[PDB]
Amino acid sequence: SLSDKDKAAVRALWSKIGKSADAIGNDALSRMIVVYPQTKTYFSHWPDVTPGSPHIKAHGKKVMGGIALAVSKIDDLKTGLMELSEQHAYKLRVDPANFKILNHCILVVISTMFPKEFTPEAHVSLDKFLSGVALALAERYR
């Protein structure tokens, strides 16, 4: 669970980097599909499964939109992400192991783009947060 310290840390970092959510999204989804190409399986309905492609760019927008959503719903991520959980469970059937992969890639992305803001303290809190997002997204699965 996230303590008040953790929530304030996530809120403060997102206050700082939120402006760049779209670019963070493209960079993270791009890293996911190149470094972890097994993930491309979920996007076979797209011809353009390649770093920075139009479907990846536009999609990265939606995903970090979901993270901004999670930041606003951080006191209750289960309730907050229930609709997104339903989407990944029944429409998308995404194995929850892949949330861990994307979470690593987002951390890597933020480290590249905000090294000063991404302190070890920011990191442990955001990692706890993203693990919590991952747990909430699995809510409707089984």
Binding site: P37, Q38, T41, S44, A89, R93, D95, P96, Y141, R142
Partner: protein, 146 residues
Amino acid sequence: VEWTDKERSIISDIFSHMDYDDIGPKALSRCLIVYPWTQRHFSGFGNLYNAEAIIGNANVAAHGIKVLHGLDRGVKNMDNIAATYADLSTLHSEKLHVDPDNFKLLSDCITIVLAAKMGHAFTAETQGAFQKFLAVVVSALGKQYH
């Protein structure tokens, strides 16, 4: 992977006594229930939004037997398992778009269904060898994913 003689013997014993038409449907059924995202690849098999509808499903039961028999070639090709499964890996990746993590999950379900059938004979050493085998076959099935 370097196999010991005990390991080859355990796997050999397990597959020679394997009731495939029993274990295969049970392991895939349990996978589809415990890990319901694996239902991604079974759409037209019928309605499986239920455990009893899953367990009663013949298309599902037929695919569990095939999949279990997909292990036989590794049993015979124990020092050539990556090469032997290369075609199947490429099929699952480019044809079927199967997330390879699902192979691990199914593998755990087969272990558990096999553990229930074998009971006390499914010792710590037996489970180690059997999981070792599946581990190598799972590596092989995910190897040609690009």
